[PDB]
RNA sequence: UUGACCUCGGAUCAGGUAGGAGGACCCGCUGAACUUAAGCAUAUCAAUAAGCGGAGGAAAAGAAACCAACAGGGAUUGCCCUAGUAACGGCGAGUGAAGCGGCAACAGCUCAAAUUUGAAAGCUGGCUUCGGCCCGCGUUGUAAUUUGGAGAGGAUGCUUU
RNA sequence: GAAUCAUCGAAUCUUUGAACGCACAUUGCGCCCGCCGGUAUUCCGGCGGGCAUGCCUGUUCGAGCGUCAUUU
């Protein structure tokens, strides 16, 4: 009826199968340097994947959509240096 | 679970049946048949799930409760009245000699001490009736075909016939022969 | 080319050649084993046998007591004065079915 | 009229209902194989205007192809690549046409209309016996489909001077040194 | 030098078990049984069941490999598949509610409930089974016995009343042939019933008919195999009767009239046209059958032995000689009861029986009613 | 543990997706199907007007041919076919519209309830393109239209029209401009809380 | 319990299909370097050579989202001319068309977009006495009509098979 | 009616090879249908018909709480 049991079985099988088997810094740089403002940020945030249901959907389908919903934005060597320095630990 | 369509349909069936029964009761029980008594075999068919008290008592007298029951009967005044009363549930008509012979031979059961034993033995037949003038199953057959004074006793002794359900095979004078080979 | 129309009543009321038209002898293959024929009816089966065949009442009671299929003969003789006294046999259809199952369920050995 | 309404949907394909349908169908296509058989098209209006017929011998095949760069760009379109893969898959059929049906962040999805040349209904139909003829073997491989013509620049005008009659043939014609008898 | 396995070779090659045979033939158990009985296959016994199959039991039955190969190469396999697809189609129609298309589907089906004839065509297999009309006459023993059983028996789901009626007509036609050709030779009656022995083309044919009573069917009996046997012997008797009437010149099938049959003519219903010791027994005799006597056996034997005129009671049947006992024409009357016209002679069915068997006119004084009957003898 | 077949797993996953996802109003009103009594009465009338099958059509053609060898009115029958029915609705020749709820290209239908609403013809959505294809003598049909019937059933046609346009139309008209879904189960609730 | 509809599969089931070869000419993909610039790197060589895929007797192209500014032309294709002009260019080396005009040949069409709706009129297979009987496809659309220098529908009166 | 004749519409056409039951460097090894001979219902040997893949149409079979119902 509610499908909870079948969803439980599907998620358990997906977990068993799993067990068996720069862009952000670029945007931060564009916001910091006087290049893109708040309105431009929301304008660019209105993408083809806007209003993507993420809470009521099964974990496996959400993982597939997260794998295949990545838009390619230009990156910069300054952003690469920044992310390398951020990831460099003690 | 049962539904309002069935409630309404059953109530209208009961109402119309009551109206028709009152119609016959008020009208004179005179059928368009000669005053001579006849022989008619009657087989009952499930027409209505619920039956009024008068047809129920008539069917009780005619012992036609279990499915696909038939029996021979005298066509007289009172019997014709009862048949006209129970008309929707019964289908009746003149039997054939071959029809009655085949019916008795293929499906024949004797009633003794409230038990239904097959008409295997003329010895059993005579231990049952014996002194009334019957001498065998063929004697019962001839009595039924040409009614005698012992017809009531013979009808009481013979168990009501249970015809096999056909797969597709009012009053009619003769087609009961086709129907009896159909259910036999 | 097209048959003119005929209604279903006509179609309903509307709805042999010799087997050995060309017959030649055929040798019987050795592999085939014909089923043995049933024995002819004996003197014992008769409804009105000579008094010698009549069994004792005690033997009749013992036969009735014995369980079915445990007897050498399925029948014991009985004497009837008239044919109308003779009753139909109970296991005629059962014997028919048993011999059919013997024909088509029991192996045949030469 | 229903095909006209479907055409309007395909025009406003970015709307809510069409976006939902393409989302669900994209999930289904990812779950299925790279190449698979459709008896009925996903966009019947587009299939009909491209030439799909409700006949024994017409099939649709749905194919997913990797998208992106090959900074050298692969001059053959993803549509042509899908048609060619369909050709190697079922070399028996003839590629009638192809149309985009869906797209993702990694794969682009096409549906190809294919015709059976050995079925006598297709042989009888005088509108398709042309592709029954042997000249149309591997049109996708020779670039004879719509994507092939678009990539070959088979259009009229001064904008297509070098390719209206064949690029290589035009090159050869312009670079032949013709010498007559009476020079 | 080649190494060769024991199991793959020998009796395992020659014989196959029932389960292996049904798995190879690819049919369900009832259809497999029907086809095996149709082709006449019997299991037989191998010399070494362990050698046939190391894993075997005495209860297990084996089958002939060549016989299974024939079963594969019978076209009734294809007819089986087509018919099964046809019940699939009629179920299609019934589920969809297409009453008319369902009617045409059952028309194509030609089901043996309305049909009364075999659902399938068995002419080729009966031809293969019986190379000779002599073999047909040899199997006529079981054929006639079993069909007369079915003429007596009532109808069930597996055996329709129409097909029982056709079996009754076939039995009546065979009886008409017997009475025409005087082929009947010996009659014995016992508690089981009446055994008839008739000589046709030098072949003795035996068949047993039970008495006219309500026969109980209590117990575990299967009508489906029994109904298949019905179809067997019905088709076989039809073909044999056609052949016999062609041999004697009388047209086939003989015409029978429905109104007289319904009133109860029985044997008298059929009309036979010749062109398209036995007789001297009762060559010139007039016989009457009383109400108690067995009408069908008595008339059958009298007509088979040439008694010209037999009459009986009106309730017994229709299409007879004068029913009135006061008629002086009746030389002999068969009465078995616990009139007294001086001209008529009162005799018994046992008198007729022994007179027919001995062919020496056994004394009616010895066989008079009201006295203890001397024991009879079995001609066999 | 045990492993399920690929297509079975995919098919169950698709039903889970349809019942989980937030549904646009068109597919939502597709989800909202009518009741058993209305379906049964409509099926009764539609069966009394089911189209002639091929056997009896050829039979009546042969009837007419033999009559020519050795007088009618316009046939009233249920009209079937997506394009035919949408044109009939556009021309306002349709009296009642029945729509299959399971057209596997769903775009074939998305606009049909709305066009019926604006045109004015009463419409309903029934379960089973299979039942549509059995009402007609086919395997499947997308839409079924009743345009005009004979005299004897004017009354029951009008009564069925009123019954549907009140008791299904208003009932699913109060709530059809929203988005469906939201059928999260216990594990879904716990997963969302943990997320 | 039963029977559909849809989807996905198996069968040494029935009927067919694809390989490879050849590749002078043809249609696409992919794609160098030597050399020249008296050195060389852009360029050139060359949208070539090698490699890959695909047909035929020809292939390809083809009936304008064209040319043009005309007093207009009028599918495509090949020759002459336009012309070493325009145009582009380490403005060096160099690269390099097209309209028009004279010719050769010349042929126009099929669809999707409509409701046959007073009648799926269409088609596949096997079974044949070869004449007509079924099964299936299909309304999520097969016949007829129609394709924008058009057409449909009525009325109308001529003329064709 | 000759020919190392011409034409050529009819046949035979060994093993391989796109190479196709598996193997291939063995005249080896397999499974289904039928036959033949030698003690032969069993044993042996041989012979004939067959058994690749992807796809299309049709036939048949199977699976799926995907899904529809079915009290008149």
UniProtKB/Swiss-Prot annotation, chain C:
It is found in: Nucleus, Nucleolus; Nucleus, Nucleoplasm. It comes from the Eukaryota. Transmembrane segments: none annotated. Residues 55-70 have a biased composition (Basic and acidic residues). Residues 51-70 are annotated as: Disordered. Component of the NOP7 complex, composed of ERB1, NOP7 and YTM1. The complex is held together by ERB1, which interacts with NOP7 via its N-terminal domain and with YTM1 via a high-affinity interaction between the seven-bladed beta-propeller domains of the 2 proteins. The NOP7 complex associates with the 66S pre-ribosome. Belongs to the WD repeat BOP1/ERB1 family. Component of the NOP7 complex, which is required for maturation of the 25S and 5.8S ribosomal RNAs and formation of the 60S ribosome. This is Ribosome biogenesis protein ERB1. It comes from Chaetomium thermophilum (strain DSM 1495 / CBS 144.50 / IMI 039719) (Thermochaetoides thermophila).
